[PDB]
Amino acid sequence: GLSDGEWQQVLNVWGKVEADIAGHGQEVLIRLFTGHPETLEKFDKFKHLKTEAEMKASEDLKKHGTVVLTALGGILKKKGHHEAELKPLAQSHATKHKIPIKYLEFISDAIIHVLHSKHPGDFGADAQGAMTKALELFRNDIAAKYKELGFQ
Ligand code: HEM
Numbered sequence: 488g489l490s491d492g493e494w495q496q497v498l499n500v501w502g503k504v505e506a507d508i509a510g511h512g513q514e515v516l517i518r519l520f521t522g523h524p525e526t527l528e529k530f531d532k533f534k535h536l537k538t539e540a541e542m543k544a545s546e547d548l549k550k551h552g553t554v555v556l557t558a559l560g561g562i563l564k565k566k567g568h569h570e571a572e573l574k575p576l577a578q579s580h581a582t583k584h585k586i587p588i589k590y591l592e593f594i595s596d597a598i599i600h601v602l603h604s605k606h607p608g609d610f611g612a613d614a615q616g617a618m619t620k621a622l623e624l625f626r627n628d629i630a631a632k633y634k635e636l637g638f639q
Pocket residue numbers: 526527529530531532554555556558559575576579580584586590591594
């Protein structure tokens with residue numbers, strides 16, 4: 488449950504991401520994969536990436552980063568009214584990709600890390616609070632769908 492002012496902060500922060508969705512998406516995934524190498528194993532199409540240099544050079548990783556952040560941005564712009572947008576992602580990530588909710592926590596924190604890394608001094612405490620709450624809401628609603636599906 489975010490206030491109007493918190494959603495305003497979220498969407499203000501998101502404008503930073505939308506200016507360079509592929510660069511943000513790439514860095515989010517690289518942060519996820521390098522911080523939590525087990526997550527790489529969930530991607531048949533990225534498990535060949537042995538080094539961060541290879542990850543950085545991967546155009547397909549940037550492409551997927553764009554897909555991920557485009558989806559997330561579409562969800563965030565719903566300001567919590569995202570059941571229709573979230574449902575297929577929860578279902579695909581539980582049933583097809585088999586992504587534990589822990590990895591969604593990892594990527595949520597990776598987003599925060601990337602925002603500070605790319606916008607140092609420009610991702611204020613209020614913005615971090617609002618973005619964190621929005622990612623918690625996202626993760627929590629996914630978690631509810633995971634529970635429905637019995638997925639761990
Ligand atoms: C912000 C959180 C995430 C968003 C918005 C997101 C979004 C997406 C989207 C839109 C797709 C393609 C459509 C689909 O298959 O449903 C996808 C595919 C996929 N996602 Fe995610 N995802 C997120 C987090 C994760 C995490 C944390 C993992 C694993 C650690 C993961 C693993 C995968 C895999 C393996 C695929 C299939 C990739 C392929 O083979 O093309 N996702 N994701």
